[PDB]
RNA sequence: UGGAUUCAACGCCGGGAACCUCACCGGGGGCGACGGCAGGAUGAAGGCCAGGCUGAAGGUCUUGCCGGACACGCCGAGAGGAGGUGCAUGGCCGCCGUCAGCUCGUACCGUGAGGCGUCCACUUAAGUGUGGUAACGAGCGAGACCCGCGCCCCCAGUUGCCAGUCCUUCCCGCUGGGGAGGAGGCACUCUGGGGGGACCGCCGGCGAUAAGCCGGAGGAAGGAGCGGGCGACGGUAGGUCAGUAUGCCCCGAAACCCCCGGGCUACACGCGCGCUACAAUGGGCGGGACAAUGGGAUCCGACCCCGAAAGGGGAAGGGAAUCCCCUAAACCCGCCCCCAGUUCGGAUCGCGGGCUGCAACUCGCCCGCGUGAAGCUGGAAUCCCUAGUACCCGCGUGUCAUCAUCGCGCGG
C-alpha cells in the first residue's frame, strides 16, 4: 500500500461552495450583509440573541 | 489648547446617556469646556428574511432590525481630563474612541 | 432642496405665503389664503405609505395577480 | 444679468452659435459618426451638435463648479431601450466631454483644478454673461416682469 | 371606524368619579391633570380617554 | 473594522459560545453567560444552576473549557468564573432542560410537568405554561399544555416580561419538545391602581 | 436530480445552478473509530524520482528509490449519508385567521351527556360596549403594548445647515445686481434624546337621555390620526426529516468523502406569473430640470489621462452625517416623422470589439455596425385596488467573481 491520498479539499474562493454557514454548514442561502455568514434559517432562529429586534 | 473627540456608540440609549452624564459631570467638576453630546444618525441594520424553511405556502417575511445609536463629544484635551475619562467605566455594550484634534 | 418639481413648487408656495403673512401682519390676508387654500399656510402632512411584501416594488396594496 | 436670470436651452443655442466663431472649438474627426452614449440608438441628426454640446458643458461648469467628466457623464446620460427588457439609466461616453473640456481650456474659458474638476475662468463667465444679457434684452421686448431682473 | 371606551377605562373612570367626585370638573384638561396626579397611568391616550369619560359623566350628572 | 461589524461579531461569537455550552453543561442548568474584555484578559461568567457540575473534579472542567474557549473561539485570555441564578424556578430554560432531563430519566410527563408547575408557582410565579409535543402516549404524536396561573401571550409585555424556554428530550423513540413560559410577579399596563 | 398541483403549487423552496452549489449522468480516486483475525517493521505503516497506462494523476506499475515504523488482506463493530420515511417526530412556516373566537370559578338548570354565562336588541374593526337577561365575576385573545410618520417645546450644534455680520475675490453691466472662498455663529433645515398634543374633547343632529354614529368648528392631526410588529385555544397526518435537531429502515467500502467532464440551460407542445409592444394620450435627435431609500476594505472609488463605445491606466478621500456609489426616469423646450407593419416594433441571426473568471463551446454579461420576426387593442372568462392609494416613472439593496424582465424596499 504505497499510494497518495486524494481527498483534495479544494479551496474555493468564490461560490456557493466558498461560503458556508458557521452553524449548520449550509452552502446556499447565506447572509453576508454586514460581516455575517449565516443561513437564513439560523439567523431567524438566533437574531434576538444577537440583538436584532422585530419592531416594524 | 487642542481638542479631543469622543465618538461613542451603543445599542442602549441609557448606557449611552450614562456615559455622557459621566463626562458632563466630570468636566463641570473641573471647568473644561464641553461641546455637547451631538447625536449622529443612528444606523438601522435591516435584514429581511423569509420566515419559512419549506418554500411552500404564502411568502412571509421577518424584518429584523439592529439599531446603533451614536454620539460625539468634544472636550479640550487636558492630562487630567484624559486620565479620568480613561478611568471611566465604559460598560460592556458600548464602544468609544478618543481621537484628538490638534 | 427636495424631491420633485411639484413638491418644490408647493413647498415654496408655503414658504412665501408664510413669509408674506409674517412680513405684513395682515390677518385679512391670512384669512384670504386660508379660505383659498388652507394648505398654503398649514402644511400638507401626507407622506408615502411604506411598501409591503406582495409585489412590494409597486406598492403597499398593489398585489400580484392570481 | 446672468445665466441664472435667463433660461437654459435658449442660452445654449445662442452661445453655441457664438462658439462657432472660436477657433479652438473644432469638432474631432469622429464627430459625424458616433452617438453620444450607449443609451442612445441613433447618430445625432444635426451637424453642429458638437457646438451645442460644448455650450451645454460650458454652462454646466459655470453653474456646478469644480465638476469633472464622470459627473457630466451621468448628466448627459439617460434611458436606454434594452429591447424586450425593461429600461434603465446609462451614462454617456467620456470622450466627447473630455475633448470639449480640453477645447475650452485651450480657448480660455475653463481651467482645471488639480483635484475637484474644472472651473470656469473670468473670461469664460464674461462670455456667458454677455450672451445672457443680450438674450435677456431680446426677450425683454417680451416680459417686462423680467425686465425687472 | 369605532372608538369605544374599553371596560378598564370605564371602570377606572367610574371609580375615580365616585371616590373623588367634586375634584373632577367639566374641563377635559383639568380632569386630565387630576387623573394623572391620581392614578398611575404611564399612558397618554389612556389618561385622555379616562378624562373624557369622566368629563361626560360630570355632564350627565349636571343634566340628571 | 466598522462599528456595526464589531457589534455583529461580538454577538455571533457569544452566540456560538452559548450554543457550545448549552450542549455541554445541560446537566448544570446552564442559563447563560456574560463576557467582558478587561485589559488583563477576557473574563467570562457562566450563570448556571450547578457550578459543582461545571467545575467537576477540582477545576478539571473549567480548565479544559477555557482551553477550548481560547482555541476554538477568538479570545485574548479566558478568565472563566461561575455564578448562580438568583431564582432558577423563575428562569424557564433551566426548567425546560430539567424537565427534559426528567423525561429522559423516564418519569411520566404528566407527573413531571405538574411537579415543575407546583414548584414554580410555589417559588412565586404569577403564571406558568408548559407544552409537551411529540410521541406521547404511543406512535401518533400529540401536544399537551399544562398551565397554571396567569399568562400573557401577545404583545411587547409578553416579548419582554415572560421568560420563554425550549428544550428537546431525546428519548428512545424520538424527540419530545418542551416549551416553558413563566410570568413572574411584575405588572402590566391595564392594572391602573 | 428532487419538493410543491384549487384557494394555500407553478420569478416558490430566498432555486439569478459555467466549477462548487448537487442531490442526476459518464469516468477516476480516498474512507473501518474500537477490538480481534492473516500477519508483522526484516525497514516500512505512509509519502515517493523518470516514465507506460490514465482525461490527468506516485492511482497503478517491470525497473529500481528511503525519511525511521503496524495491521479491511478478514470479521464484527462503525464514521459519514442532500439515502427513504414530514401519515414516526421536534422546531419553524402556511391556511382556517389579525378571524373573533377559546375558556374558567362560583351559582343555577338537567338522572345524565351537557347546558347557562358565551343569549336578545342596538353598537363596534373587535365575545368592543350599552341595556335586557339564572346568572355574577374573571382570564387568554381583541384592545392595551412596541416601532415609525406627521405639528409644537426643551436640550444638543459636529462630520450637518448657511439667513444675518465682516473679510477677499470674479462677472453682467442698465453702475443696478449676481455668484464664489474664509472666520462668524446654530438662525433656517437636519440629526436624535426627552416632553407636549387628539379625548367624539366642543356645538348640532340621529339613536333611547346610554353605548355610540354622523355633520361642523377649530386644529398639524378628527373620528382605533396614518401605517406596521406581536398571530389566542386548537385544528389542518397541510409543507419542511433537501437548513439544523431526531426515531426507525437502509447504505456502509458503498447509497460515505474528493476530483474531471456533462446535466439541471435540452423542445413537436399545454399552463401560471411577468417584460416589451402593437404607436401621436407617440418614436427619434439635440437641449433643459427635479429625488429618496440604502451600501462601501481588497471595498466604494471622486479627479486626471487613453479610447467611438463597452472599457483601460494612475489615483485624492473614505471603515461612513466628512469621501464615493449619486446631476434618476417619467416631465419640459426646439426640430424631423404625420396614421403606415411606418423614423412603430425590436424576435432572430452575421461580423467584430471587450469584462469577469482557473474555465465563457455546451453555457455568462457588455459594446458597435448590420438584419428586421410576429404584432395594428385582444372571445369566453378573470385579477388588483378606497388617498399620497391605484396606475405610470425610474433608483437602491439581497442574491452577487461576473450575471436582475426576480424578491425586499425607495422616492417622483
Ligand atoms: Mg363561543
Ligand atoms: Mg394587539
Ligand atoms: Mg388617539
Ligand atoms: Mg404534516
Ligand atoms: Mg402529507
Ligand atoms: Mg425603433
Ligand atoms: Mg396603426
Ligand atoms: Mg428569484
Ligand atoms: Zn445555519
Residue numbers in the entry:
A (entry chain Q): 1 to 56
B (entry chain M): 1 to 102
C (entry chain L): 67 to 132
D (entry chain V): 2 to 150
E (entry chain T): 1 to 64
F (entry chain C): 1 to 193
Authors' description from the paper:
Ribosome recycling by the twin‐ATPase ABCE1 is a key regulatory process in mRNA translation and surveillance and in ribosome‐associated protein quality control in Eukarya and Archaea. Herein, the conserved and essential ATP‐binding cassette (ABC)‐type twin‐ATPase ABCE1 plays the key role for Archaea and Eukarya (Pisarev et al, 2010; Barthelme et al, 2011; Shoemaker & Green, 2011).
To gain molecular information about the post‐splitting complex, we solved the structure of the archaeal post‐SC by cryogenic electron microscopy (cryo‐EM) to an overall resolution of 2.8 Å. The NBSs of ABCE1 adopt the closed, nucleotide‐occluded state with two ATP‐mimicking Mg2+‐AMP‐PNP molecules bound in both NBSs. Based on our high‐resolution data, we can resolve both catalytic pockets and unambiguously identify the non‐hydrolysable ATP‐analogue AMP‐PNP complexed with a Mg2+ ion in each NBS. Comparison with the best‐resolved structure of the pre‐SC (Brown et al, 2015) reveals that the functionally important hinge region opens up in the post‐SC, allowing ABCE1 to adopt the nucleotide‐occluded state. In contrast, the entire hinge 1 region opens up relative to hinge 2, which results in a 5 Å shift of the hinge 2 β‐sheets β25 and β26 and a 10 Å movement of hinge 1 helix α15. Together with the movement of the HLH and the FeSD, this conformational rearrangement, which we term “hinge opening”, leads to the formation of new ribosomal contacts specific for the post‐SC. The FeSD is linked to the main twin‐ATPase body via a flexible linker connecting the cantilever β‐sheet β4 with NBD1.
